[PDB]
Amino acid sequence: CPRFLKVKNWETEVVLTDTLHLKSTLETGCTEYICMGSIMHPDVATKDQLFPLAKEFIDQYYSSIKRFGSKAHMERLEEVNKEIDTTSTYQLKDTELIYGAKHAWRNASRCVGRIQWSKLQVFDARDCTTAHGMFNYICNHVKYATNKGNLRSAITIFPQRTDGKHDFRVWNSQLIRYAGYKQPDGSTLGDPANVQFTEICIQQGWKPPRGRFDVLPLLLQANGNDPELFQIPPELVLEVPIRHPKFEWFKDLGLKWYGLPAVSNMLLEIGGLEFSACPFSGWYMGTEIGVRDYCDNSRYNILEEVAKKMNLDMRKTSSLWKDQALVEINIAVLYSFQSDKVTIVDHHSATESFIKHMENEYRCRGGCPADWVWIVPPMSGSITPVFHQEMLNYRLTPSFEYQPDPWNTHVWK
Amino acid sequence: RFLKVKNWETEVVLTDTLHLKSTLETGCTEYICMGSIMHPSATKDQLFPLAKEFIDQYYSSIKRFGSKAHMERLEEVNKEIDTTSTYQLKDTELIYGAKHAWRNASRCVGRIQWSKLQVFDARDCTTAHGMFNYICNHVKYATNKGNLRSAITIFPQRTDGKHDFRVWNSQLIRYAGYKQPDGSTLGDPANVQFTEICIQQGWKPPRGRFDVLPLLLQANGNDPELFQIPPELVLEVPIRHPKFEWFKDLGLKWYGLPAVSNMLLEIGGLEFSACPFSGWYMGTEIGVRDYCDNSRYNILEEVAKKMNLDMRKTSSLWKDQALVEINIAVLYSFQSDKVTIVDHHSATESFIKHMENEYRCRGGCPADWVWIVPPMSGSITPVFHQEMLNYRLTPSFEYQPDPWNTHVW
Numbered sequence: 001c002p003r004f005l006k007v008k009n010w011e012t013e014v015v016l017t018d019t020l021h022l023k024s025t026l027e028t029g030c031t032e033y034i035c036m037g038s039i040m041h042p043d044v045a046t047k048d049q050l051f052p053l054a055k056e057f058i059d060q061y062y063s064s065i066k067r068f069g070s071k072a073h074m075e076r077l078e079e080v081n082k083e084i085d086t087t088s089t090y091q092l093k094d095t096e097l098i099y100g101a102k103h104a105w106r107n108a109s110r111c112v113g114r115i116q117w118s119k120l121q122v123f124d125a126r127d128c129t130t131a132h133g134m135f136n137y138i139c140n141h142v143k144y145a146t147n148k149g150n151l152r153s154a155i156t157i158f159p160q161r162t163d164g165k166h167d168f169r170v171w172n173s174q175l176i177r178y179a180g181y182k183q184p185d186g187s188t189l190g191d192p193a194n195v196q197f198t199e200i201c202i203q204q205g206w207k208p209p210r211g212r213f214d215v216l217p218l219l220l221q222a223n224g225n226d227p228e229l230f231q232i233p234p235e236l237v238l239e240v241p242i243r244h245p246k247f248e249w250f251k252d253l254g255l256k257w258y259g260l261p262a263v264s265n266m267l268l269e270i271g272g273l274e275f276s277a278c279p280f281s282g283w284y285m286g287t288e289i290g291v292r293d294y295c296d297n298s299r300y301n302i303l304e305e306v307a308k309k310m311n312l313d314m315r316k317t318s319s320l321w322k323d324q325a326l327v328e329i330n331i332a333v334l335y336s337f338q339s340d341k342v343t344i345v346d347h348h349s350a351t352e353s354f355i356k357h358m359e360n361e362y363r364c365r366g367g368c369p370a371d372w373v374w375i376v377p378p379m380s381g382s383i384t385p386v387f388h389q390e391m392l393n394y395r396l397t398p399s400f401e402y403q404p405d406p407w408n409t410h411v412w413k
Numbered sequence: 414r415f416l417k418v419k420n421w422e423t424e425v426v427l428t429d430t431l432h433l434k435s436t437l438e439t440g441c442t443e444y445i446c447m448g449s450i451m452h453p454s455a456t457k458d459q460l461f462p463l464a465k466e467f468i469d470q471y472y473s474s475i476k477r478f479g480s481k482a483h484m485e486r487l488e489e490v491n492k493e494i495d496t497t498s499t500y501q502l503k504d505t506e507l508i509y510g511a512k513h514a515w516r517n518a519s520r521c522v523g524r525i526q527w528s529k530l531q532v533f534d535a536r537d538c539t540t541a542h543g544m545f546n547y548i549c550n551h552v553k554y555a556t557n558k559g560n561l562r563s564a565i566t567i568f569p570q571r572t573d574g575k576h577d578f579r580v581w582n583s584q585l586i587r588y589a590g591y592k593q594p595d596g597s598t599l600g601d602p603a604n605v606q607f608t609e610i611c612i613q614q615g616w617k618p619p620r621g622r623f624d625v626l627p628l629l630l631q632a633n634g635n636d637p638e639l640f641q642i643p644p645e646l647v648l649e650v651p652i653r654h655p656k657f658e659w660f661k662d663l664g665l666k667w668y669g670l671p672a673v674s675n676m677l678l679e680i681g682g683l684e685f686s687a688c689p690f691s692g693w694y695m696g697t698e699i700g701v702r703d704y705c706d707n708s709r710y711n712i713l714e715e716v717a718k719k720m721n722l723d724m725r726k727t728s729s730l731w732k733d734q735a736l737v738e739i740n741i742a743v744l745y746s747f748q749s750d751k752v753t754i755v756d757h758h759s760a761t762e763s764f765i766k767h768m769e770n771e772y773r774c775r776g777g778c779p780a781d782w783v784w785i786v787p788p789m790s791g792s793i794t795p796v797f798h799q800e801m802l803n804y805r806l807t808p809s810f811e812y813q814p815d816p817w818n819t820h821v822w
């Protein structure tokens with residue numbers, strides 16, 4: 001593995017040199033003979049597995065605070081060791097928890113928003129014991145992060161995994177999302193992405209309003225127990241109705257979206273410890289709602305209706321009526337959020353910020369893992385600076401990881 | 414092992430076995446993915462095994478693997494390598510090899526067409542004049558009055574490296590670009606360096622916005638010579654818009670025939686350093702990349718002004734709006750002039766169909782997502798949600814260094 005790897009930006013001719021990749025921990029899935037960079041994803045750690053994972057992390061932490069090789073570093077290593085020796089696990093100090101969380105985000109190769117990585121409110125919920133307790137923590141998270149539209153990024157971290165049979169999980173994939181319902185005629189009402197989860201909620205007791213934008217209940221599992229239902233107080237759920245600055249008819253589609261993107265099904269991995277419930281949130285890039293959430297065929301799929309109202313020729317694809325429609329929808333989204341003073345970033349701004357962030361990281365850190373397939377926005381790719389930017393992808397730790405859906409593993413009590 | 418790729422829109426799962434035949438490197442490792450790097454990473458001793466592998470698959474493709482003819486061919490090639498340090502492809506092999514180079518081009522969304530490829534054998538060429546004759550014939554055949562037909566012209570293979578045939582142009586047809594004293598760029602900024610080389614070599618530039626470059630042709634390692642393609646062979650399309658009558662006043666145009674002339678074709682260990690190949694355009698190639706790149710024509714501003722868009726904030730999406738109109742214009746103009754062109758929706762759709770065909774009849778299809786996904790409206794095309802496996806099969810087209818960094822005059 002070569003000490004230096006060069007990436008080039010093909011628009012600016014800027015060449016950057018990556019050394020950070022030498023700290024790569026896990027595999028990517030790619031080999032010498034195959035690249036899997038477009039694959040979406042390519043009981044517990046034993047004592048002997050745990051030791052070097054923890055030491056690697058503790059060393060990295062003390063190196064970060066410029067106390068590497070210090071008495072404090074050496075003592076902490078010893079304390080972590082004895083703890084793993086007598087309990088087969090260990091507890092992170094608060095400082096270490098906060099550092100690990102920030103760094104999992106800093107290391108998230110698919111995240112274009114990482115320039116903000118060091119500004120992350122970390123909520124320590126490691127004392128939580130019940131789903132009601134989880135509910136309380138999540139509400140406080142939602143309220144803090146929402147901040148009346150002036151969104152602040154944040155993460156709440158619940159107790160780490162122990163034996164694997166006492167996991168804490170948020171069964172929701174996001175804290176806030178809209179229900180989808182399959183109708184007997186095969187049609188779908190609400191968000192088609194959410195049909196299975198909605199179905200689980202209904203089975204667990206949830207009475208669905210059966211509308212187009214029903215906010216789902218939280219489905220919360222504590223200490224390996226059966227998950228429990230809770231309704232988020234509506235006044236904590238900031239929403240933005242979607243209208244257009246030129247098209248007066250746009251509001252008549254009755255679209256709206258929630259302001260707070262809060263992903264809740266991922267696993268936070270720090271120094272070998274596994275945090276199976278660690279909901280984190282930031283603010284939206286417009287395209288996430290306007291291209292994917294609205295215009296994906298497997299989603300709300302409104303390109304057609306907008307095109308109709310725009311009186312476009314929808315007979316030939318080469319009229320580009322879809323492309324035209326896609327733009328206007330994204331314009332509506334950005335305008336609607338800005339009008340209501342709810343934080344949102346357009347894809348041009350986000351991508352330019354990312355390029356600057358990447359350059360800075362190459363300078364202060366020796367690199368910045370980035371997944372081009374995910375970094376480039378789902379519309380207008382080549383007119384954003386990341387399109388022409390060569391990137392290196394690799395997995396650093398701490399990191400956020402996928403985990404199986406809990407209904408597939410849970411032992412019902 | 415066997416690998417699965419999933420389409421997340423249709424849930425279709427395909428199984429790849431073809432990658433097990435891959436012999437070349439991708440540039441990645443278990444620890445580092447280089448999928449977005451543009452270019453990552455003979456002798457008798459190495460030559461025969463490469464030749465064998467190819468001859469083997471050729472005879473395999475015609476259901477005659479291990480035939481007397483197969484064995485005879487292997488023996489013939491061996492002796493030919495012994496007594497001359499190289500070997501020559503049969504016409505059949507040449508045609509098979511070229512089609513398969515296209516077939517294996519992971520970055521090409523147009524590969525549904527791979528077996529319709531007119532192969533011009535130019536291996537008897539000895540001079541720049543010969544090359545020019547061949548290239549004019551290629552262009553006239555491929556253009557076909559607007560009904561474009563894919564073609565490749567293959568010049569003699571490399572011998573010792575000192576006698577290479579090279580087409581110095583990156584494409585057969587391109588517009589020049591000129592560095593203006595006031596710092597800017599007239600014409601096409603992609604071609605500033607090449608243009609200067611042509612000027613330095615005797616070319617008299619008209620200094621317009623759309624000057625067709627001369628061919629700069631190198632034969633048998635000698636210095637390159639200049640030729641002007643007869644204009645009646647160069648099909649062009651004036652760009653206008655079906656709604657915006659002002660669009661034609663921008664005075665934009667483009668050439669009908671995309672013909673890449675700077676890559677290397679490799680077959681059975683042999684290297685063809687001059688092998689211009691051509692197809693027809695996907696609209697975005699012109700309308701997004703050629704016109705709207707910052708390091709290219711960069712006319713987004715101009716079009717956005719004429720649309721009376723607010724260009725003060727990026728969040729107005731004025732660039733995106735202008736981008737779609739430019740691409741509508743490109744498609745409309747070509748279609749109106751009955752010049753073959755494909756939109757990115759139609760193209761990506763066809764590619765999905767092609768992948769299904771390849772998985773069925775070949776056990777897979779190497780594909781580079783980073784390149785297959787179009788440079789606009791990504792996720793509203795079916796390829797965006799389609800998992801792809803990228804791997805390198807041979808025969809293949811490869812990058813090679815620009816000749817003005819290797820040549821001694």
Ligand code: HEM
Nearest residue numbers: 105108110111112113116153154280281282283284285400
């Ligand atoms: C502050 C504003 C933020 C913006 C604008 C932003 C933007 C994005 C976008 C556009 C994506 C791709 C989303 C998709 O296509 O599904 C993404 C992915 C991701 N983000 Fe960020 N994000 C932000 C905050 C955060 C925070 C606070 C964290 C963690 C602490 C985070 C971690 C991640 C991770 C782990 C992924 C990849 C998930 C996967 O592999 O599926 N982001 N982000």
Ligand code: HEM
Nearest residue numbers: 515518520521522523526563565690691692693694695810
């Ligand atoms: C017939 C219609 C064709 C269409 C619509 C088409 C389309 C495309 C497009 C859009 C690209 C991406 C290029 C870029 O954005 O820079 C590409 C790449 C490529 N095409 Fe095709 N193509 C066609 C025919 C052909 C033919 C006839 C050949 C060769 C015999 C070919 C070989 C290649 C190769 C080797 C690349 C990638 C070059 C690289 O690795 O940089 N294509 N094609």
Ligand SMILES: CNCc1cc(C#N)cc(OCc2ccc3c(C)cc(N)nc3c2)c1
Nearest residue numbers: 001002003004005018019020021022023024
């Ligand atoms: C003795 N210190 C001065 C020194 C001299 C020379 C010389 N001449 C080369 C040096 O490289 C150090 C180094 C360290 C790590 C490396 C890794 C992980 C990978 C890799 N491919 N190369 C590496 C090279 C250092």
Ligand SMILES: CNCc1cc(C#N)cc(OCc2ccc3c(C)cc(N)nc3c2)c1
Nearest residue numbers: 261262263265266280281282283284285402
């Ligand atoms: C379902 N699509 C694949 C997918 C799967 C999983 C999993 N498991 C998680 C995914 O998270 C993307 C993400 C995560 C956090 C984000 C934050 C904080 C802000 C923001 N604007 N966008 C974000 C996007 C996406």
Ligand SMILES: CNCc1cc(C#N)cc(OCc2ccc3c(C)cc(N)nc3c2)c1
Nearest residue numbers: 671672673675676690691692693694695812
């Ligand atoms: C400059 N950008 C990277 C780049 C480098 C090189 C090299 N060396 C060649 C490139 O050609 C891509 C290509 C090749 C053939 C094509 C054909 C036949 C048809 C078509 N519609 N599009 C095509 C696009 C692009």
Ligand SMILES: C[C@H](O)[C@H](O)[C@H]1CNc2nc(N)[nH]c(=O)c2N1
Nearest residue numbers: 387388389390449450451783784
């Ligand atoms: C950095 C990146 O790999 C580079 O800009 C690539 C990305 N995808 C592309 N895709 C196509 N079709 N053509 C290109 O030139 C590029 N450029």
Ligand SMILES: C[C@H](O)[C@H](O)[C@H]1CNc2nc(N)[nH]c(=O)c2N1
Nearest residue numbers: 038039040373374797798799800
């Ligand atoms: C098949 C492909 O990897 C998949 O659809 C990816 C492509 N790139 C993406 N990029 C982002 N930001 N989000 C996504 O969901 C996807 N989906």
Ligand SMILES: [Zn+2]
Nearest residue numbers: 030035441446
């Ligand atoms: Zn890879």
